[PDB]
Design a binder for this molecule. Structure first.
Ligand code: NI
Ligand code: NI
Ligand code: NI
Ligand code: NI
Lengths: 254, 255
């Protein structure tokens, strides 16, 4: 039994066939999934899915790419939604230097505001980092994010950054489809290097479908290919990776 | 007057409006462009473009993504084509760890074979690196690529890597649209750090259209936006970056 700790079932890409996508994941041993909302539309859709399906939990927050759209009203709105017993984490939050819609200074202020929110709610945080690794680490360290705990979601950095993440911040590291890519050296090295007690699995569906479905619409059932690859890389049974990644998710979340 | 040192005018995206695109670049002061062929199809199209247009030059070689497709017959075909007076460089070659079509070990062998080929042709090499920076620098040092010179094309690594590229390999560094991106600081840091006498501009059209056309089909005319951005970052005139990038191109290649 696995948990897909990070999935966008709230995406328009599932509008035709969500029920079948969820059934395929359940039938593959994916018993629980954490639906991630990161702006007004995706939060609304997320809150409707966690009401409709018993085994779906919500992570809500504000995406760095959309940081310029984050208002005082949105921050009070997320704080009141988080009182829902199945809203278990705050995110995906962080920094993204690939897209230019939001400048870095606005991204950093929205990031700090959501750390402060997560501390008030006593919920863990889910971190999106794209091309902003050292700026994210400095923020997590400055804002004492070790108080709330969290995930560096779909982490690709050096093992030296992984060690700051697990040993200084006491965060978890989630791995997704990229651990399955042939020439993806960094994620395979992260999976080998990081303790099994710090690892979580995710799809980020519909994005980043693993081998052998790269370029195709991802779905939560494919989290089994991530878990298989972690088993292969660490010399562990699939059963051991399912059991430990579940233990880890249950420990971090409520 | 500027040179677009790296463009894919051979791309299907120009099938219906190539003439208009070339005319728009020429009117914006982009007098010469270097068309890049990197597999059977793109080489054949590039070879045709340089015979049709007086001011287009060719750079031919084999792309790391398609390294598994490279044969002994392709290596001999490229060696022959390179005799063309307007074939001035071999590339784009290198390493790409984004895509999985070709495994690193086969990409490394094909990269080494084209360094050896460029040494025989006495022609400079154009380097494609994606997510493989240290593996590329190691190959270039180990194979004494300083003997042919070349371009780190669309470079975005650290200043330490730039100093190895310029001060040890004696390569040039080209910048494209990403120098116009606000949040990706590394290209701007490279533009500020690297000597004006080591810099070239490119579009890589139709990819990586600069601001304010991010998302849109790129074209060689947009190399002026890259030139403008460099001038601002190095506190130089546009005329200065145009003249220096042209002298650099004219010195590395034999046009
Ligand atoms: Ni993300
Ligand atoms: Ni996500
Ligand atoms: Ni390239
Ligand atoms: Ni190119």
């Amino acid at each position: 039994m696995l948990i897909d700790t990070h999935v966008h079932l709230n995406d328009e890409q599932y509008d035709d066939d969500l029920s079948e996508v969820i059934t395929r994941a359940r039938e593959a041993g994916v018993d629980r999934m954490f639906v991630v909302g990161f702006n007004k539309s995706t939060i609304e859709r997320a809150m409707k899915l966690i009401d409709e399906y018993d085994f779906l939990y919500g992570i809500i927050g504000w995406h760095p790419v959309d940081a310029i759209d984050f208002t005082e009203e949105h921050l009070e709105w997320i704080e009141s939604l988080a009182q829902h017993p199945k809203v278990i984490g705050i995110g995906e939050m962080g920094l993204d230097y690939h897209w230019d819609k939001s400048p870095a200074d606005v991204q950093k202020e929205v990031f700090r505001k959501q750390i402060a929110l997560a501390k008030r709610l006593k919920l863990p945080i889910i971190i999106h980092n794209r091309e902003a690794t050292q700026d994210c680490i400095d923020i997590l360290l400055e804002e004492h994010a070790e108080e709330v705990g969290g995930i560096m979601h779909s982490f690709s950095g050096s093992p030296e950054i992984a060690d700051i993440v697990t040993n200084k911040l006491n965060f978890y590291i989630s791995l997704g489809g990229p651990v399955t890519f042939k020439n993806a050296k960094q994620p395979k090295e992260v999976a080998k290097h990081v303790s099994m007690e710090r690892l979580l699995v995710e799809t980020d569906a519909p994005y980043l479908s693993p081998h052998p479905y790269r370029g195709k619409r991802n779905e939560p059932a494919r989290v089994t290919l991530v878990a298989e690859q972690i088993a292969e890389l660490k010399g562990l049974s699939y059963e051991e990776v399912c059991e430990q990644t579940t233990k880890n998710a249950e420990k971090l979340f409520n």
